[PDB]
From a paper:
Human [name] ([name]), a homotetrameric 127-residue protein, is the main carrier of thyroxine (T4) in celebrospinal fluid (CSF) and the second main carrier in blood. Interestingly, [name] also interacts with amyloid-β (Aβ) and plays a protective role in Alzheimer’s disease (AD) by sequestering Aβ and reducing proteopathic stress.
When [name] crystals of the P21212 crystal form are soaked in FeCl2 at acidic pH, only the B monomer in the asymmetric unit changes its conformation, whereby the E-F helix and the stretch of residues 85–92 undergo a rearrangement that is accompanied by a variation in the dimer-dimer interface. Human [name] crystals are particularly sensitive to FeCl2 soaking experiments. The largest anomalous features for the [name]-Fe complex are located in proximity of Glu-51. On A monomers, the electron density can be fitted by a three-atom Fe-cluster and on B monomers by two Fe atoms. An additional Fe site at the entrance of the T4 binding site involves Glu-54 from symmetry related B and B′ monomers belonging to the same tetramer. In total, sixteen Fe atoms (including the clusters in interaction with Glu-51) are bound to each tetramer chelated by just three residues from each monomer.
Author numbering:
A (entry chain B), B (entry chain A), C (entry chain A), D (entry chain B): 10 to 125
The structure:
């Protein structure tokens, strides 16, 4: 798994379950081609999005939708989408972990990049 | 002044200075319309984006252009932007402060609501 | 005012109000001596902790008492405190701002240095 | 592993390797008994600190020292210790993950608590 996504809730200190994640790649004619997608697990993690063979250098957009998570808590969320855009594998192949930390009025996001 | 944006640099222990900030507002056809923009001062604050009477109820998006910020300091950062999305309610006159904390690989955004 | 401490609540989207803050200074026998303390105002700011002439070069520690803060709001938080440790250099007159962002299970501290 | 510790560098976006970690437990006569200790790995993680049989309810202090990490980067760090104090296993057994995010002027720390 070269690309992991974690989502956490800063209020509850728990993993965010069933967050929808959509990954896009910037395509040749200046548009976003679909690339991968999934839901986060009990542990709030999602990998198995791609393989090193499909995860070529390029520009990727990672979108999350947290509607299912707040719904199951009985929370009527105010906002529920977040996104990052980064450039991948420019120095050849790396593993990316992208973590998001949720509060109703605060959003934090961190990227860890490691060598496979 | 009803809308403040404050931005800090976690690497250098200082306000982020001259960072461009674009504020959009969500329009009747669910698109984003430009609302305001500016650059951060030496103390990292940007205000004078809008008057009380022009900052109506709605959904607003603040894009802080951090890629150019880090690149100017000779750092290839991970993110393109820092963003946050928030809702202004039609309530009384209220101060909205958007605070941003920046690293090359991590950032956090927070919307703070007060009365002056 | 050379030492400011600002504290925000990420859950409630507001300044943290009435939070106790204790500042210690590292003494000649490598122990911590009380330096200053106070409570945060309605805008979450605490200043008037020290004068320019009494805030000498050294190593200082800010303990923000967040357990009691969250418990007062009926939340059993994870941390006891938020802390940060920083060094004042003997340089010119400089403004030190300690900013704190608080959730029940996550918190961040930042020391910002400016000139007034 | 009921107790994991991660340490990350927000400047480099990399795991912090060889961070020394010392865990203490609050003992009956109001003092800190040693409990567990270790160094973080290539991936910045440390588990194998304890077992569910030794990780009883109580008050634990987790200390890190990041001297070896900065040394190997050729960095003369200003500060290099951090600590959290929390109460464990009060609602019976839980798994704790404690993550710390480093910048020279900013420190963030998050706790994720999950059900084994
Ligand atoms: Fe499972
Ligand atoms: Fe299960
Ligand atoms: Fe995992
Ligand atoms: Fe101000
Ligand atoms: Fe909001
Ligand atoms: Fe002020
Ligand atoms: Fe410092
Ligand atoms: Fe290894
Ligand atoms: Fe290895
Ligand atoms: Fe692991």
């Amino acid at each position: 798994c070269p690309l992991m996504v974690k989502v956490l809730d800063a209020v509850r200190g728990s993993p965010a379950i069933n967050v929808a994640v959509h990954v896009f790649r910037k395509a040749a004619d200046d548009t976003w081609e679909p690339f991968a997608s999934g839901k986060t697990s009990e542990s709030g993690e999602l990998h198995g999005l791609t393989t090193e063979e499909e995860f070529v250098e390029g520009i990727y957009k990672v979108e999350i939708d947290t509607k299912s998570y707040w719904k199951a808590l009985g929370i009527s969320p105010f906002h529920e989408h977040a996104e990052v855009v980064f450039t991948a594998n420019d120095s050849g192949p790396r593993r990316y972990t992208i973590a998001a930390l949720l509060s109703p009025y605060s959003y934090s996001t961190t990227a860890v990049v490691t060598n496979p």
